[PDB]
Each structure stands twice: as C-alpha cells, then as structure tokens.
Design a protein around this ligand. Structure first.
Ligand SMILES: [Ca+2]
Ligand code: NA
Ligand code: NA
Lengths: 104, 103, 104, 103
C-alpha cells in the first residue's frame, strides 16, 4: 500500500511534468480551441443549447460517439465529418508525442 | 497444434507479468476506482439503477459510447465530459506503459 | 502513380508478412473465438437474430459502439462490460505487437 | 507568445512533412477510397442519401460510431462488419507508421 502511493506520486509527477512540454501545451490549447469552435458551431447551426453543443463536440472529437443526437442539417453533417478528422489528427499528435518522449 | 498452445502460454505469461508491474497496478486500481465513482455518480445524480450506472460508466470511460442513455442534468453532462478525458488520460497511461515495455 | 503502386505493394507484402507471426495468429484466432462466443451469447440470452448478435459483438469488441441496441437483461449488461475489456485487452495486445516489431 | 507560435509552426512543418511520405500517402488515398466505396454502398444497398451514406461511412470507419442509423439489410450488416475491420487495419497502419517515425 505504501509502494502503491509512492508509485502513484512518481507517476503523477511524471504526468504534470508533461504539462510543461511546449508541444503538449500546443496540442492541449488546440484541443480547447477546437472544442470551443464546435460548441459555437453546434449551438448556432443546429440550435443546440450550449451545454449540449460542448457535450456533442466532446463525444465527437474524442471518438467516443453519440447515440442520442445527430446533425440535422447538411451543413452540420459536413462539419462533423471534418471535426472527426481534426480530432483524430489531435490524437495522433498526442500519441506521436508519447512515442517520442519514450524513445529518446 | 502444440506450437499455438506454447505461443499462447508464452503470451499469457507475458501478460501476467504486466499485472505485476507497480505502475500498471496503479493504472488498474485508478480505473476501477474511477468506474466506482462513476457508478455512484450516475446512480445518484441521474437516478440510474447501479447496474445501468456501471454500464454507462463503462461504455463511456472506454470510449465505446452508448446509443441509448444520455445524461439529463447539466451536472451529469459536465461530469460526463470530464469523465471522458479522465478515461483518455488513463488510456494514454496504459499506452505509454506498453511503449516503455518495448525497451 | 507508379511509386504509389510500388509502395502499396511493399506495404501489402509487409502486412501479409505479419499474418505469418505466430503471436499475431493467436491474437487473431482469439479475436474470432471471442466474436463467436459473443454471437452465441447475445442470440441466446438477448434473443437477437444471429446476424444482429455478431454485429453487436463486433461494434462492442472494437469499441466502435452501438447506438441502436443495448442489452436488456442484467446478465447481458454484465457480460458486455467484461466483453468490452476483453476487446481492449486484445487491442493492447495487437498494439504491443506493432510496437515490438518496430523496435527490434 | 512568440514561443507558442514558433512551436506550433514547427509542429505544423513536421506534420506537412508526413504528407510527403509515400506510405502515408498510400494510407491516406486508401481511406479516401474506402470512404467513397462506403458512400456508394450505403447509398445503393441501404437507400441513404449520399451525404448520410458518407456520414455513416465516416463515423463507422473512424470507430466513432453512430446512435441514429443502423443497417437494415443483412448485406448492409455484413459489409459494415468488414468495413469496421478495414478501418481498424487502416488505423494500425497509421499507428505503425507514427512508431517508425520515432526512430
Ligand atoms: Ca464509439
Ligand atoms: Na455510439
Ligand atoms: Na472509439
């Protein structure tokens, strides 16, 4: 139980240590910027309550997928498709990062 | 085929060897803990039966997603959003771990 | 266009070359075995038509997620949760593999 | 911050550098091709409007999944199942690629 906590602490430290890498900060900022754009787009174009627009943005960008709402306009559908790929681009970016910071 | 069996047993051994790594154990405990917290939350705030709260917590934290349930309260929605990123943080942790074991 | 096809051929060869690795064959067999068990379970316990049981098994095991059907019995719900983790275990296995066969 | 900008530009350059790799180009063309085939298939066999066939093809091949549409024919279901694995095969290809670029 003591080793558990010490390992947890070293791990958390390593995690926060990653919140210092500039390229990671960019990916993060870019992710937040993308989530905001999505929240704005879906509330405006699909008429979703802001909180539901951020929610749809989140489940869509992280690839989790939504099983309750689906864009009704041809405009929302096009945007969502592009939105999915941006999210995949961001994920690869984070993954590439982890891979690089592991083989130095 | 004896080959297939031996190869599988080798892989199983390498797998059990992982469940011995302390960092992997932390990641595992943390997800079980996160899953329990999730179950509690959706039971309370969303009024779901425990088994449905665990189910939703699971399909959500694993990114599988569900096409049947959707949080009704703003609190439940905000929590789900953070829950998802915790899940992603957890997956990256496991992924980073498998990458380290590749050296 | 010629380079394209030559790269495609080298890549395909490399792919088929992976269908020779014994550990990969095991993961594959294990995946097929798991999909069959799932098809049997969901058709039997949830009363799903076989084709719909394999389908649900597939979208669930690959984490794609289903937005039309959800287990109705407490038994199906427990199994699905365990099913999801087996699938994640299989994915990590395949990923660990790719990572190893890249850093030799 | 000039730092942030320079770092982003560096990352963007490294990204464009990827779109120059032949193997990455093949993977990209193959997914666009797979996406088009998917659009054709769901338009024909499932009677979906082209834009809805592309949408479904996209949320399916990317593993995101959809909680609105579900194939009605047995042909559409069997195809979707193979479609998913093609998508996974494609993702592993990109992942394997990013791993190689780590050396
Ligand atoms: Ca999903
Ligand atoms: Na879904
Ligand atoms: Na997913």
């Amino acid at each position: 139980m003591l080793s558990f906590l010490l390992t947890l602490k070293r791990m958390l430290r390593a995690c926060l240590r990653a919140w210092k890498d500039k390229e990671f900060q960019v990916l993060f900022v870019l992710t937040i910027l993308t989530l905001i754009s999505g929240t704005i787009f879906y509330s405006t174009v699909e008429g979703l309550r802001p909180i539901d627009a951020l929610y749809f943005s989140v489940v869509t960008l992280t690839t989790v997928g939504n099983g309750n709402f689906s864009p009704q306009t041809d405009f929302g559908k096009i945007f969502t498709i592009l939105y999915i790929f941006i999210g995949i681009g961001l994920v690869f970016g984070f993954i590439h990062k982890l891979a690089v910071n592991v083989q130095l």
